[PDB]
Structure 1
């Protein structure tokens, strides 16, 4: 319950009323366990099987198609004759498709997995507590510990709950809290109060956080909070909440699915106004049962003409293809929808350590004393190449390599690094790369030697495995490490007492090798090493050294520096108390300064040009890290996020600072700041939300669990391939190769897909505007229906399907990565395109019904009932207006419809070749520029002549036509559409632009 790391240990105990020595009593554990509950994170329970099936059903797109398919039963029963058992295919097929959309859609909900579960993997099973009923410590279930009881932790343990350190038994406590800062560096705790209320995790040096593990030492503390009220418990709470929003495209489809509903609901009320021929014109005559199906039969037909149910099928297949495509470029997408959103990305938020950097400490600079004369001190600076722990680099003076051994000082520099170091390198045979063993800040020195190769020992022939410790192995031979004075906060340094090899009885030859914070170690040096000689430490030589240290640890090259010294004449081995660290400082006195090393977790090789590529595509890249501002800014200046001299004083905040800005100032800082450092997991998330409060599509790139809350928050979570499982689990996309450059490639691919997608969506829907105009006409006049929903489904699912989907392969425009991000506000159809389709809509809305009055009015090989009053009487419920009457059911012939249906099917093959572009006539847009588009159309008109000749088929769809001329008739009703369009473009391509 207690949320203070700012109180004394004595006050914290007082808080819970527990003794540091005894521990909680049974009664207290009864009440605390009561008031606070168990120490465990709640699991989010996954897919609700009744709520993944329901999501597919609740969208007017299926609601309307439902009532319709359902009304296709009310009107399915009313049919005299045996033609009622062979007239349920329509209501059948209809529903059957809504089932396919359900099945198909659902199957791709690939969040297969639990990030919350992945997180819980950080809560240990057991914990160690001290409670009143026993003197010995007890190992209980971690979920049984409560705020208030004394807990004990040590080397290897995984902190069971947020704890306030009360006492450190080891001379120091080394904790690894990357799980909350993304940094593996071990942090050194203490038990003093941290005064700042608003302190961040990176500040609570007197707290132990649930989920982190103890790198070194043993300690005693009091449990401050448990379960959901802990830092990792917060990450958990932020993940649970956040849900992904509908795609910019999905969105368009939504508003559309609403209007499309408002429209029809009015088109019907519009026919009830025109067709008041059953409310104020006729007589008694029954039409309240027969002519009553003229207000329902068109209801379930008007629906299938507005709802392009088949569009989903196209996108899904399109996206799925993109997936595998990107997967070849090394980006594994786990959710299709983000594939489209990835195209329109304006902001990429990114983690530093392990994402933009390799996360492998490296010694990149080092220097030794060169020359001394009073008041003049010159050094010998050096640079080291290599960004990995791999011994893959060479040292070099003035950008030109120089064998280290030819320099005496560097022989000692290298010796201290190898000897005063409790870590090691190691080639992982499986993964195929070297990895560190111990403190990464130390393994950096281990690798530094293998590179320095001071004794020239041959290592070129060695195995990749054994060359890992070659040069260091040698050095171990040269000197025997006796014992090592640990590191202590009071001296910020450590040491190793060593003795000359092959010397058994003598006194002389021994020496200690020291390392640590420059300031402190330097001050304890009375002599400086000059190659092999040794001269005293004067003010001029002091400041000189310091100067370079000061520059090296703050510039555009902020580096962690270590002073390296040696005590030539260490005290008598039997004159030291090796059990009292408080005495190590004096044993580390009268030292001889040797050199300085500069570390850094360097940028991945390709990040700089990747950042550039984003800049060109007008995408902003913001860095958000748990590491320190000093370091973040220096990485941004190398990565290219900041220019080398660019004033940054107002566009790079630390989490604390940022918490201090007003809400308004914050939202604003997000648009200008590009570097937020020393943040907590929530800060990352927060910044993303603000960035999203500008309608911007934001991406989050990370590899840590501290990156989880923002990954789940961005429109697109991108985890590293080498990242943590939880980060991966929370992302929509993974980088199989860890190269920040593949994000660039993925954005490209996504841009290209979004275009082509946009095409088949304005093509496959435009048709519906024609199908609806067609129906509305053939009902606002009274004419015989030329098209029935049954056919209106094949045409939209296959007939249009194949073409529409061929457009998805539209050749990606060249120079598509030099254009800014598509604005989310931008509707797919508005302006002149709204009219161009508003035009191509009316044309087909007519040319289909008119094809019907060609088999009746202008009828040659058919019922030439030239102006027989289709509008007036189609009824024929007395053959009186016709003398010689004995046949009126010709208004039901399968030919007047096989026209509109053939025209339609033929018009769409055109618009498909017309929609291969937006402002480019087919003369500049050759139809053969899309191989798959030609084949599709072939495949289309070849499916028409299938459901037109295959005996069973036309039985269900209605009867044939001979190419006589009737087909040629269908042509001069469609083909001109091409001309019409080709013109509408020139009207824009020139009158609007060019």
Structure 2
């Protein structure tokens, strides 16, 4: 069945072989059940943990980590000549972290689910259908409906499946379709076929799409689509079809990892070339066959030194902290890398209905006829501060609180609003909020009546359940209803006749018809005949409310004090309805709209300050979208919007060259399909701009998937929350601004500690390369490198993750996504730092070799040929040979590396500001982590079993002073580099004296002037 709206009810019923009066038989029900399937949308399949683990390998950082670990284990198996099993420890310690963060990668996701599925109303859709088994209607489950079923729908009932209308039992049928198309006002439905086959969902006025609900009437229909074949099913399929790429942070990390792998390959090739041809010496090896093992050991040590193992752990820690901060700020984050995406966001695309506005119609402005004379009059204007269905609020007359009990005309206005309508407002604790039960306008009138207590009813000690209708009931008892003249299309108004416990008849409708059908006006408590001037005045008020700066739905109200009695009523004719109120007393009019949320305008201003562009993409009409844009501040009140607001049809006809500056300039998009929303998001992404698509409902589900980051309102549909990466549980729109702020700060911290880790890794690489080239014995075994790069390089990195945010963070435009984390000059600076670190470590080892008070004196680089001396040959000196395996040089190099890393973390507090201007105690976490890691290093040195796992030994006072003497100049070098970067306090210096002056006490020539 296709294009059911284009076909009349007769052939639609004939196609399925179903009768409207009887329905479907059980055999037909089961045949259609097996032919089509279950009438439900399939849930997301449970991603097994094994698949998640195997797909976590896709990141290039963990890719290089895993390949390095695998090669290390392979060469651990290669080194079968050793006996102690502790060697096989050195690869294993890697694998643990490769799991740890991975678990967190799953764990947080699970937490997100625990916060996403919790914000769902798990009430099965319970649908009334007609079948041949029983004449009366029967209530069945949602999944039991099959195409061809006859469904009776009523007010307040959610539509179970796509239903073509057959006949409306009531007068008119109103359907709220804000879920599917973002329409802010209910749509009237009819059984007339729609000739256009390619009509949009809003053009189809003879269809009841799934997910929507009925507002006013009751109707009968025939199901034409179920499950996936429905409009929501097609939209969900389109959302699943679209592919979400990696986050910009993930892309930057992947590029960084590719560069790092290229560096590893280049350095390994270079060291192999510089080390090949060294087998010509009369040593063992079997033509480099047995020297290949030593060369590969050097290569794997270099690869380990070049890969920061603790980087993923600190990255995950920072992302988890940001996610926790959003959890505190009522924002659920699905994926850890997505918390930074808002920081680099340039354009924010937002839905109007339900996202920018509360989707709850409310009255904001009302006027009563105050003072009238011949041809001129003065009107009393009022303003309502309520934005939602909650009955809390105050009425303001010329910007001051006012009680409506003093105004009689306000009393009649409240009476008409409370009595003429037929809907109501209720409060529930499952969601803990207020909902409507009928038309949005009627419940808006009810909320307006409740807000203005004309009868001064007590409310300070009343429960929230009866708060929704606290004073509406008070109005109802005193003036009891008799009957209702329903709404008529030609009349554009509807009336209620009622009698007291005299006998007035209220009428509410469009301003023009109501004011044309009235022959009296109400001034306070007095009746005044027709005079023109008041008529033009009130008509001007009507159109300045309708088409002014704020677009409002004007609703004229009148009362007939002398209507015809009950007995002379003919309710069977709609034509007779109009003539029953030929003489009316116009009381007043009210203005209602779907108001934007109170936190939108300030958030829009803040986003404009941060350089972020805000665009409205909605399915509603252009006028309402432009009005909301003007209200929230996207456009000015008098600003022209000729080339800044577009419709889907207008955008389609636009040339791609015109579409270029349309996307770069236009800020309002109205009447767009979900495919059009995804097309707009893709076009914006085609200009290298990070897109934050915030919204709710089904119509935003594909776009939420297409954008770089998708944000879903907590009151939105389940599909929208599934397609999004962030969820606003409390529906606070400033949370987006807060998330952007922390994302910028988090990216700054990322840059800081990635640069610190790269400095440490290049230092280790230079140390190993210099040791290999110089021929000296190894100064750093790989397990020490793992211990350093995890503990001593994660605790300072975690502390750097707590860097204080910049003051000018939110007053600058978003960063260019194409820029790299490490610039050329910063790369040179950190390369120099690493070269100094490696030179310092090698120099400490050589200093222990050649000039040590408690060590040997094999100096002038003689006998430094490692793996060469075996006995007392002439090149062999007086000292022994086993001293080359002493752990003293190893622990000296380790201590120098640790101290230099402490200094590098100390002066990496700022990108360019000197450590003198910014004292290190600004970040107490930094000094805390430095002290903790130094304490752990001391514990490693002075504990029983670890100094055996690590080939180290405790030092003495002189060696420690030498270590600090070597380590401190890195602070001066970094300060000089920062100074030359900037150009091209007292309390800190006071603490410098007890340290640097102590260094001046002892001076040593170092006895090292042979080569370097």
Normalising by structure 2, report the TM-score: 0.88
Q: Whose helix proportion is higher, 1 or 2? A: 2
Equivalent residues in 2 for 1:81-92, closer than 5 Å: 83-92=83-92
* Deviation at residue 494 of structure 1 after TM alignment: 1.7
- Match 1:902 to one of 884, 895, 908: 895
For 1:128, the equivalent position in structure 2 comes to 129
Which whole-Å CA distance do the structure 2 matches of 1:109 and 1:435 have between them? 32
* Deviation at residue 287 of structure 1 after TM alignment: 6.1
Return closer, same or farther for 1:104/1:208 CA change in 2, 3 Å cut-off.
closer
Which whole-Å CA distance do the structure 2 matches of 1:443 and 1:839 have between them? 71
For 2:930, the equivalent position in structure 1 comes to 937
- Match 1:632 to one of 600, 625, 634: 625
Unaligned runs of 5+ in 2: 985-1012
> Residue deviations 1:102-150, cap 9 Å, x none?
334432334436979999968736562557x987767666545554554
Which whole-Å CA distance do the structure 2 matches of 1:460 and 1:951 have between them? 74
* Secondary structure of 2:970 counterpart: helix
Which whole-Å CA distance do the structure 1 matches of 2:411 and 2:73 have between them? 93
Which whole-Å CA distance do the structure 1 matches of 2:456 and 2:207 have between them? 47
Point out the more displaced range, 934-943 or 384-393.
Answer: 384-393
For 2:917, the equivalent position in structure 1 comes to 924
Return closer, same or farther for 1:461/1:790 CA change in 2, 3 Å cut-off.
closer
> Residue deviations 1:750-790, cap 9 Å, x none?
32222122211110122111211222232234332111111
Return closer, same or farther for 1:875/1:242 CA change in 2, 3 Å cut-off.
farther
Equivalent residues in 2 for 1:736-815, closer than 5 Å: 736-815=729-808
* Deviation at residue 158 of structure 1 after TM alignment: 3.0
Equivalent residues in 2 for 1:351-370, closer than 5 Å: 351-369=351-369
Equivalent residues in 2 for 1:847-866, closer than 5 Å: 847-866=840-859
Which whole-Å CA distance do the structure 2 matches of 1:578 and 1:887 have between them? 120
For 1:618, the equivalent position in structure 2 comes to 611
Check whether the contact 1:310–1:797 (CA below 8 A) recurs between aligned residues: yes
Check whether the contact 2:364–2:385 (CA below 8 A) recurs between aligned residues: yes
Equivalent residues in 2 for 1:70-89, closer than 5 Å: 70-76=70-76, 83-89=83-89
Check whether the contact 2:73–2:91 (CA below 8 A) recurs between aligned residues: yes
* Deviation at residue 683 of structure 1 after TM alignment: 4.2
Return closer, same or farther for 1:17/1:625 CA change in 2, 3 Å cut-off.
same
Which whole-Å CA distance do the structure 1 matches of 2:416 and 2:511 have between them? 15
For 1:301, the equivalent position in structure 2 comes to 301
- Match 2:819 to one of 812, 818, 826: 826
Return closer, same or farther for 1:291/1:135 CA change in 2, 3 Å cut-off.
same
Which whole-Å CA distance do the structure 2 matches of 1:81 and 1:939 have between them? 38
* Deviation at residue 61 of structure 1 after TM alignment: 3.5
Return closer, same or farther for 1:345/1:271 CA change in 2, 3 Å cut-off.
same
* Secondary structure of 1:203 counterpart: coil
Which whole-Å CA distance do the structure 2 matches of 1:317 and 1:626 have between them? 40
For 2:998, the equivalent position in structure 1 comes to none
For 1:512, the equivalent position in structure 2 comes to 505
Point out the more displaced range, 304-313 or 359-368.
Answer: 359-368
* Secondary structure of 1:850 counterpart: helix
> Residue deviations 1:865-921, cap 9 Å, x none?
224556756323676453678943333322232232222112111111121112122
For 2:548, the equivalent position in structure 1 comes to 555
* Deviation at residue 338 of structure 1 after TM alignment: 2.3
For 1:269, the equivalent position in structure 2 comes to 269
Unaligned runs of 5+ in 1: 502-508
Superposed CA RMSD = 3.6
Point out the more displaced range, 441-450 or 732-741.
Answer: 732-741
The reply on whether 1:234 has 2:227 as its aligned counterpart is no
For 2:422, the equivalent position in structure 1 comes to 422
Return closer, same or farther for 1:354/1:156 CA change in 2, 3 Å cut-off.
closer
For 2:1010, the equivalent position in structure 1 comes to none
Return closer, same or farther for 1:480/1:149 CA change in 2, 3 Å cut-off.
closer
Return closer, same or farther for 1:328/1:99 CA change in 2, 3 Å cut-off.
closer
Equivalent residues in 2 for 1:285-684, closer than 5 Å: 286=286, 288=288, 290-369=290-369, 379-400=379-400, 403-425=403-425, 436-454=436-454, 456-457=455-456, 459=458, 463=462, 465=464, 469=469, 471-501=471-501, 509-534=502-527, 537=530, 542-579=535-572, 581=574, 583-662=576-655, 665-666=658-659, 668-684=661-677
For 1:946, the equivalent position in structure 2 comes to 939
Which whole-Å CA distance do the structure 1 matches of 2:63 and 2:471 have between them? 74
Point out the more displaced range, 137-146 or 442-451.
Answer: 137-146
Check whether the contact 1:361–1:444 (CA below 8 A) recurs between aligned residues: yes
> Residue deviations 1:245-278, cap 9 Å, x none?
4333332221122232223223233233222225
Check whether the contact 1:115–1:730 (CA below 8 A) recurs between aligned residues: no
Check whether the contact 2:119–2:714 (CA below 8 A) recurs between aligned residues: no
For 2:46, the equivalent position in structure 1 comes to 46
Return closer, same or farther for 1:196/1:540 CA change in 2, 3 Å cut-off.
farther
**Number of residue pairs aligned between Structure 1 and Structure 2:** 982
Return closer, same or farther for 1:262/1:625 CA change in 2, 3 Å cut-off.
same
* Secondary structure of 1:821 counterpart: coil
Point out the more displaced range, 517-526 or 580-589.
Answer: 580-589
Check whether the contact 2:101–2:316 (CA below 8 A) recurs between aligned residues: no
* Secondary structure of 2:628 counterpart: helix
Return closer, same or farther for 1:656/1:871 CA change in 2, 3 Å cut-off.
farther
For 1:700, the equivalent position in structure 2 comes to 693
Return closer, same or farther for 1:898/1:730 CA change in 2, 3 Å cut-off.
same
Return closer, same or farther for 1:769/1:527 CA change in 2, 3 Å cut-off.
same
* Deviation at residue 558 of structure 1 after TM alignment: 0.5
Return closer, same or farther for 1:155/1:706 CA change in 2, 3 Å cut-off.
same
* Secondary structure of 1:799 counterpart: helix
Check whether the contact 1:368–1:595 (CA below 8 A) recurs between aligned residues: yes
* Secondary structure of 2:508 counterpart: strand
* Deviation at residue 54 of structure 1 after TM alignment: 0.7
Return closer, same or farther for 1:780/1:195 CA change in 2, 3 Å cut-off.
farther
